[PDB]
Amino acid sequence: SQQVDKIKASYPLFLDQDYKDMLAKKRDGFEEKYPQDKIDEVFQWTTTKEYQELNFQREALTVNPAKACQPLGAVLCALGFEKTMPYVHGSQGCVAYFRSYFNRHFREPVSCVSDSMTEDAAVFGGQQNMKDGLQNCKATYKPDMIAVSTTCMAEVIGDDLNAFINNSKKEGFIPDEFPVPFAHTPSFVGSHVTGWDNMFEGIARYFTLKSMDDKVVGSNKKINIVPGFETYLGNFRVIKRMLSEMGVGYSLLSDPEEVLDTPADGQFRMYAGGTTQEEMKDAPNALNTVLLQPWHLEKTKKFVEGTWKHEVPKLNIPMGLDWTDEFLMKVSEISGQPIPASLTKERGRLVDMMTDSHTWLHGKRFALWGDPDFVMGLVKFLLELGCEPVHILCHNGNKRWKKAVDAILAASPYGKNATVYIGKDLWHLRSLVFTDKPDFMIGNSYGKFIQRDTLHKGKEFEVPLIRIGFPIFDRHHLHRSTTLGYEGAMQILTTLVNSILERLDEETRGMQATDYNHDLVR
Amino acid sequence: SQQVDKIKASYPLFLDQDYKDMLAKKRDGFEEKYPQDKIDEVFQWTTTKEYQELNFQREALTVNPAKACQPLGAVLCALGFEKTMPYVHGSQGCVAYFRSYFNRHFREPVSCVSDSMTEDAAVFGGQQNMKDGLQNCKATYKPDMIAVSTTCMAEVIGDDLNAFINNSKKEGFIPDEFPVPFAHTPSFVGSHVTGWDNMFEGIARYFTLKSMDDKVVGSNKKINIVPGFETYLGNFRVIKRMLSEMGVGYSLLSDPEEVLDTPADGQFRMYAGGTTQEEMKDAPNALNTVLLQPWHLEKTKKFVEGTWKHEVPKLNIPMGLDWTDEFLMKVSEISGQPIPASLTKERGRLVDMMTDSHTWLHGKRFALWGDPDFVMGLVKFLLELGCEPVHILCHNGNKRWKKAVDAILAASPYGKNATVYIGKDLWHLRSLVFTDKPDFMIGNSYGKFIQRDTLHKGKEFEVPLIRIGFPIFDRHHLHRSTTLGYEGAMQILTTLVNSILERLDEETRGMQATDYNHDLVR
Amino acid sequence: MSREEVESLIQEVLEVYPEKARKDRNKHLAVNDPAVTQSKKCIISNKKSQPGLMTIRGCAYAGSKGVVWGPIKDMIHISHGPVGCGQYSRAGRRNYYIGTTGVNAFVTMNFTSDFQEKDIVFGGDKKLAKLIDEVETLFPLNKGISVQSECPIGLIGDDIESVSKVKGAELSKTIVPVRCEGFRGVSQSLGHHIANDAVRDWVLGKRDEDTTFASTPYDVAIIGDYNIGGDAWSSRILLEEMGLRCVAQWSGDGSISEIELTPKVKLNLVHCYRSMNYISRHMEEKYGIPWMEYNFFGPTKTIESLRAIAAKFDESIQKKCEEVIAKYKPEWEAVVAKYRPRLEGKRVMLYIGGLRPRHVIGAYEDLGMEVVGTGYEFAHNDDYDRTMKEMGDSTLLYDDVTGYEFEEFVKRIKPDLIGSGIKEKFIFQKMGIPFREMHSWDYSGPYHGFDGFAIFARDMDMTLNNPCWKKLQAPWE
Amino acid sequence: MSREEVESLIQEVLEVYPEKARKDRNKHLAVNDPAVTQSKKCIISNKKSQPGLMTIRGCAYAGSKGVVWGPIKDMIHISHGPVGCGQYSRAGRRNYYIGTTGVNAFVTMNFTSDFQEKDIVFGGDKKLAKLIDEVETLFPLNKGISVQSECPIGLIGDDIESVSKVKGAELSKTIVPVRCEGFRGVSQSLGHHIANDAVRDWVLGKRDEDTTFASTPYDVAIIGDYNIGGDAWSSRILLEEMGLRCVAQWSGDGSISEIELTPKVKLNLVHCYRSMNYISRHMEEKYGIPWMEYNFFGPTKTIESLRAIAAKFDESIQKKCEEVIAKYKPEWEAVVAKYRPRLEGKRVMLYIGGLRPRHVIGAYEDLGMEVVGTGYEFAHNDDYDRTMKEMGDSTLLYDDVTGYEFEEFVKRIKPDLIGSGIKEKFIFQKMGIPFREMHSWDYSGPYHGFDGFAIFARDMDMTLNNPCWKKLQAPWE
Ligand code: ICS
Ligand code: ICS
Ligand SMILES: [Fe+3]
Ligand SMILES: [Fe+3]
C-alpha cells in the first residue's frame, strides 16, 4: 500500500507488515534458509582470530579486491589530453564497465570507444576491428588524437597494436599524420595505476621519441608535472595553483580536470581542456619532470630519464606537511623561484589547524587502503597528526613499496603498532578490523560493507568509514576534494577530526545515559 | 579504575560498573529525584501539540535563544580594521564572554579590551575609566585605532561616549589625532548584528562625515563592499575572489579575514590585515556601496545613502544561484566590467551539481535558524534545490523581514508548507520539530541539544542537525567554509546531499533488516 | 514530427558515418508504423556493434554474471579471470535480496580468481580448484558455486567444466561452470542464453526424481524479475494477494533451492522475456509447465496482467483478482490525480536493454506521457515485434544506438524527458533535459505494481518538473 | 632564571605601562620566596583591574550563575536581563550532571528574561513574575528557581527579592534572588560570595526543623567541586571506597535536596576554598560542622588528603583508607612509570582562576614536571598564602595578569607548557608552546583522583610531546 501524500521507496516500504509477512513466508516455504542461530554462529566465527588465520592463508581466492585493471587507468590517462578519444582495442564489455565506473565516481560523462572484438577476432585478430574502429571514431567523434589501450582478450590473443595502427594508416583508414599513441595494458599485470603508467609512457614516446635531436633540457624554462592516476579534481587544481603562486612555469601532462568538470549550461562538451599535443612535443625541453605519484610511474620515469635526459627528483607524493614542504623546496630549487609568502602563510595555517585539533586526533587508530602513493601519503600525514595507522592495506602494492612504508613507520613512534599488507583484499581487512579493531577506516565506498559487518557484531564494535580515495559511489561531489598540498592536508584534517567528533556526539547522545559528555564545546 | 594502556576519559569511564553503582546510590539516597516514569511522562508531554500551544504562549520567558547582544557584533566589526583594538566601555565580564565566544567559534585569538567599570562608576559614570583605559590600551597594545562600543551597564547609566572621548583627548590621555570611533551598542536593543551595524556606522561616520566637501562619487573607480556580521572566512575570501575575477576595483570595509586566520609559525600576531583608515576615508569616492547583508545594515544604509550619496542597490545576500547571479549582474552594471568566463563556468558547475543531486534533495524537509540575511539566503537556496523549508526561525528577525521571506516562499511551490517565526527561540523550534517533524535541522551548535531530545523520543523521531551558521563549537574548522556565491552554494549543496545520504546509510545499515537498501551507488 | 521528418532526420544523422558504418547503421534505425508489425521489414537487431562508435552494449559476462546468476543470493559467484570484470560489476546492479552478507548471502561481494600473468601462461584450472577449496573453507554456508568465465578463460584453453565436475563430486556441491566470456556474442543477450543453459544443465533438474514437495494448484514461479529496487517483491505481494503461491523468483532475491523447485509449479510468469524465454521454453518442453508473459509497469498493465494470470486458474483466483484490483484502485487513482496533471503531454525518449524500452510505455501513458522514441541495446527481432504495437505511430525506433546517434536524435526531437542508463545520464543532464535512470531506477523504486507505480510517478514528476532545469542559462547570456 | 633575573624581567615588562598602571601592576607581580609566608609582603590581590589592559577576569554573574548556581541540576536558573550574558555562558562550563535535560535537569539550558528597551525603562519585575509563571507551566518538574541578576537589574531599581518572595509563597516554590550584577566586585570572586550568601539565606536552612533524615557518623559533603568533566564523581568514588557517605555535592551534579541535607553531615570536605569558604564557615558557625580543605590532584595529594580525611573518623575508616591506597597504588604507579620519563624536567606556567593555580602543582610534580610560574585571576591574599609554600623558590607569581604581561613573561621564561584558559590558548599555540586548558581540561578529564590522574598524565604527555610543535618553522626559513 502507498499513501499518495507520503510515498515510500523500497526503504521503508518493505518494512511494512504485509511485506514482512510475505518475505517471511517466502523464506520459510522456499528458500530453505539455514537456521538463524547457525547464521549467527557462522558470523561470530568469521569475526574471530581463527577465521582470520584461515583468511590470510588464501592463495587462489580473492574476495572484494581493492584494485581495478590496467585499461581503466589507461582510459583515465587518455582523458587528460586535448580532444583525445580513449580507444580500448578489444571487447566492448570492458569499455561499458570503465565508462560506468568513472560515471558513478565523477557523476560526469566519460567518453571512450571500443572496436568491439568478437569471437571471430579470437582466431584472426583484431586488425579489421582496428582499421574500421579508428576510421569510424575519427569520422564520428572527430578527436584530434586517439589513444589506444587493450583489453585482456587482445593481450591474450597477441594483437600487435603498432602493426595494426601502421596498417590502418597505410591503407587509408586514418591519415598518416593523425596521432594514434598506443599502449599494451594487460589486465592480468598490475592494476589500473599500471595502465595509467603504460598509457602515459606510450603517449610520451609517441610524441617525443623520434624528435629528440633538437631538444635541449631546460630550454623552455618549465617543469613537467605528471600527476598519475588521480581521481580528485582538487589535486590537479591545487598543483596548478601552487605552481602559479610560485611563478613557476609548468606543463601538467595528462590534465583531465576540465573534461571531468564541464558546466551544465545547455550543451554537452565531449572534450574540454587537456594537455595539448604541443605541450607533449615540447616536454623534453623542460628543466625537469616531477612525478607526483612515483610508485606507479616507474615506466614513465625510465622513459623520462633515459630519453628526455631529465634528472627526475626523488620526491614522495606531496601529501601532508613534510612532503608538501619537500615538493615545494624541490620545485624552488629546480625553477630558481623562491617559495612565496602566500604559500608560507598557507603552511602556517595548516600548522595552526593541526595544533587546534591535535587533542582529538592524538592516538586514534586507523585502518586504511588505496593506491600505493595515496596510501603512503595518508600514512605520513596520519603520523604527522599523532594518529596511529594500524592496518595499512594496498592490494596493488609491492615489496619495495612495503619496505618504503615500513621505513616511514619506523621513523615515527606512532607507527609502532602498524602493519603493511600487500596483495591482501578487503575481506582480509574485514578480518583485521574485527580482530584488532581500529577507531576508523579510511578508504573508498567498498569499506561501507565492512562497516555494516562490524555494526552487526555490535555498536561498540562498529568501525566507521571515512571516504577518501577511489571510487566513491555513495556520496556526491567528493571527487571535487583535494588531498595534495597544504589545502588537501587541511581538507583531510578537517574530515578526520570532524569524523571523530561526529562519532563522539553519536556515542554521547543517549539522554541520561551518556549525555553527560554531550558537550556543546569540543 | 584505569588500565594504563587504555585510559578512559569521562566517556566511557563513568559507564563502568562501580561508577554506575555510585551514581545510583547518590540518586536514590540524596537527589530526591522524580520517579523515572514521571520523567518519561513529562518528556512525552513536552513532545506534544498541547505543550507546543503552551510553549508558543510565552510572553516573558525566553528559553535557549538564537541571538547574542550588540557589543559582540560591534567587536567583530571592529576586528576587521587594520591594527584596530575593540574597546568595550563598561563591564569586563562582557569582554571576557565575547572573547571566549569568538575563541570557541574561530579557534583563534580574539583581542578586545574593557575599561572595567565597577560599582563606583555606576554612580558617577565611567569617564575616568575611559581616560585611563584609552591611555593604557594605546600604550600597551599600540593599536592604530581604538573602536569603542558599550556594555549594557554603560548604556543604562547613560555614559556619553562622545564627550568622554573628547575629554580624554582634551586632557592628553590620547593624542587629539588618534582615531577613536565609537558606537552605542545597547544589548537590550536588537542583537549582535545590530551591534555590527552600529559599530560600522560609527566608524564610517568618524572617518567621512566631516570631510565630504572634496568627495566625488565614483572618483576612485571602486565599489564598496560591506559584509556585515560574518563568521565564515570563506565568505570574505569568495567575495574578494569573485570581484578580482571580474577585474572590479573594490574596497572590503571591515575585513577581519586575516586577523582571524593568522598562521602558527612561532609568533603571535595581535593584528593582521583589515580595512585601512585610508580605505575608509576614500570610501565616499567609490562608484557605489554594496551591502552584503542588508537586513542588519539599515543604519549603515541610511548613512551611506544620506552622506556618501551612494545609490545603494536593492540586492539580497548573494546566497544561492539566483541571488549570486543578481549580485554579479549588479556589480557588472555598476563597474562596467563584464562577467568573465570563469564565473560563468563556476555557475554552470554549480548547476551541474544541482542536477546531479536533485533526486536526493527533492522534497526534503528542513527546520532552520540563524541571522535574518543568512536565513533568507538559505531559504532561497533550499527552494532552488527543490527542498521544503518548513520551520523558518529567526529570533532577531522583524515583521518586514518576515514579509520579505513570506514573499520569497510564495513565489515557489516548495514554500507551501513553510512558516516563518520571528521572536521565537530554540525551545519553540524544539516543539516545532517534535510536532511537525522535518527531515533535518540547519543551524548552529545549539541545535545539537534538540537532536538529542528528538532521539530520546525515538530513532524514527530523531532530527539530525546540519551545522551551518554561528556559532559552531562542537566541530573544528567549519568557520573556514563558504556560504556565499557559487562556491558557497556548492559547499552547502554538498553538505545537504551528503547529510541526507549519511542518514540513509545509517538507516539501512541493519544487516538482514534494512541492508537490502544499503546501496554501494547512490 | 511526421514520419517523413523522422526519416529525413535519420538520413542526416547517418550522413556523417563512413560508408560501411552508414550502411550497417541504416538497418538499425526505423520510424514506427504500427499497422505493419514485422521486424523482418523495418529494424534489424542482434547484430555486432560497429567498431569505434561508442556502443552502450555490455558483454556476455555482464549478461550472465551481472544479470542472471549474480542475484542468486545463497550462491557464491566466482568471476574467473582478471580482477577488472568482477570489480566493475560489484554491487552495480540493484538486485535486492534478504540475507546476511558474507555468511549466507553473497550478492554484493566480489569473488574472483584475480588472474596474473602466470595464470594466463600456465592456465588457471589448478588455481580454480584451490579457489573452490578456499571458498568452502571460508564460506561454509554457501549453497552452491558458479564460475563465470571472463574473456581470457576461453582463449587460454582452460577447462572449467572438468574442475567443476571433480570439485562438485568431491564436495557434494553444485558447481556450475558458465562459459560467459565477454567476447562471445555481441551483447549481454548471449550472456542471458549461456546462463540459462547453465541453469538448465547444472541446477534445474536436481529434484527431478524428488517428490517430497507439497504442491498446490496455485503454484507459480516468477521468471525474469531481478528485484531491482525491490521490484519482484512489489510484484510478489500482488500475486500472493490473488491467492497464488509464488514458489520461485528468478533470480532477484532468488535462492538455489527455489530454482530447483521451479519444475514443480503450475505456471511460469515471465516478466523479462529476453533473458528467460530460453529456460521458460525448456521447462514447457520438459515438465509441461506453461509460461506466459506479464507486465507489472503501471496500473493499466498491472490490472491486465493480473486478470490474464487469474484466467489461468479457477473462479476463486479470479474473484481474488477482482478483490485485489478493487483494493488498489483508489491508491493508483490518487497517484494519477496527483501527478498526471503535471506530466500530461510530456514527451519521453527511452533507451534501455532488452525488455524495459517497451514494458514501461504503459506506465508513462497512464501518467498522460507520450513515448516518442524508444530503442534497445540488445533486443532481438521478437522484442521489436512486441514493441511495434506498444509504440505510437511515426515514433522513432533505434537498435544499438551510438552515442552520436542518440545525441543527435535528442537534439532534433527535443524530448521532455529521457530514460536510459548511467552512461547517457550526465550527457543529457548537461543539455538541460531531465533524465531518469531506467536501469537502476536512479537508486529509487520499486516501479513494479501499484506500490511501484506511486514511486514511478513521484520520480518522473520530481525530475521533469525540477526547478534546476530552468536555470542552466546564465541571466547575462 | 634566578631571583634577580625574574625581578629584572618584571621591571622591563612594566616599563611600557603608563605611570599609574605601572604603579598598580607592580604590586601584582612577585618572585616567590617560600622562606616567607605572608602575602601582605609580596603580592596584592583582589583589587580592581586596570582599564584597557586585557584582563582575563570575568564578572560576578559568571562567578554566581556560571560557577555556583548553574551546576545545580534540578533548579532553573534565570539569567535576568538582556540576552547576552545567558547566551555566552550557556554550556560553556563542563559541570557534568546526570538527568533528563528539559524535564528534570536544566544545566545546559539558557533561561533568560531577554530584556528589551521597555524592560529597561519601565522595569522588569512584572516580566519576572510572568516569567516565573511560564517556567512553572512549561517545566513542572523543576525543584526550584534562581534569578541571577545581570548588570541592568541593579541599575534600574528592580526589586527581584519582593517578586521572589511573593512568587515563592504563591507557588510553594524556592525562588532565590541573586544580586550578582556584573558591575559588583572586581571579578568572579564576589559572584562566589553573593551566591554563597544566597544559598545561606534561601536554601540552606530549609530543613532546620526537619529531623527525618537518617544520619550516620560517616556523613560528609563535598563542597566546592563542580564536577568538571566528572571530577567530583572521580572524587566521590574514592570517598565512598573509604567507607564515607557523601550526602551532598556542591554544586557539580548537585541537587537542591542534597544542598538542603548538607547541615546534617558530620564533615564538610572543601575542595575549592575560594568559592565556598563562606558557606563552609557559615555551616561551622551555625550547625557546628567542621570543614577541611583537601586536594585530589595527583596521587601524592590524593593520598595525603585521603589519610587526613580518614583521620577525622574512627579506625575502620582509617583501615578502609589504607585499603583504597593499596588498591590504587599499582594504577598510578603504572601511570607514573609510563609518563614521567616523557615529562621529566618540563617547565610549566599556569594562569587559572582561584584554586587550580596551586592545587594542580602536586600532580605536575608527581609527573616530574616543574611549575616555574603561576598566578590567579581573582584569588585573595589567603590563596597566595597557601600558594607560597606550594610553589618553588624564585618562581614567578602573577595576579590579574594582563595579556601583554603574560605573553612577555612566556617569551622570556620559555616554558615547555602553559596551562590556562581559552582566551590564552591560541595565542600561546601560535608561539609554538604546548597549551593545556586548565579550566575545561581541554574537553577531557576528569583530573581528580587516581582515575583522573591517569587522564591528566595522558593529556599532558600528548600535548607536550605532540609532533606538531616541531613543525611551526618552514624548512625554507
Ligand atoms: S534482465 Fe536485462 S539492460 Fe531483462 S540485461 Fe539489463 S534488470 Fe535492462 S531492460 Mo540493465 S533485458 Fe533486466 C535488464 Fe532488461 S541489467 Fe536490467 S535494466 S529487464
Ligand atoms: S570554582 Fe572557580 S576560573 Fe574554584 S570561578 Fe572558575 S571549576 Fe577556575 S581555578 Mo574556570 S576558583 Fe572552579 C574555577 Fe577555580 S570556572 Fe572553574 S576552572 S576551582
Ligand atoms: Fe588555530
Ligand atoms: Fe554532473
Side-chain angles (χ1 to χ4, degrees), chain C residues 187-201:
Chain C
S187 53
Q188 298 97 313
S189 167
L190 201 72
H192 301 156
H193 198 175
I194 290 155
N196 272 228
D197 285 342
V199 171
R200 173 204 59 202
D201 291 337

Side-chain angles (χ1 to χ4, degrees), chain C residues 67 93 188 192 226 228 272 274-275 352-357 377-378 438-439:
Chain C
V67 166
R93 183 164 180 256
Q188 298 97 313
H192 301 156
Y226 303 90
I228 304 309
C272 179
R274 173 78 269 121
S275 66
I352 325 162
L355 171 82
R356 290 175 184 189
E377 285 175 50
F378 45 79
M438 299 303 279
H439 295 252

Side-chain angles (χ1 to χ4, degrees), chain A residues 106-108, chain B residues 352-353 355-356, chain C residues 426 429-430:
Chain A
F106 289 108
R107 283 155 212 290
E108 294 290 297
Chain B
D352 167 278
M353 295 167 68
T355 65
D356 293 341
Chain C
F426 307 107
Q429 283 194 334
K430 268 155 206 288

Side-chain angles (χ1 to χ4, degrees), chain B residues 80 144 180 257:
Chain B
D144 285 340
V180 194
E257 168 251 316

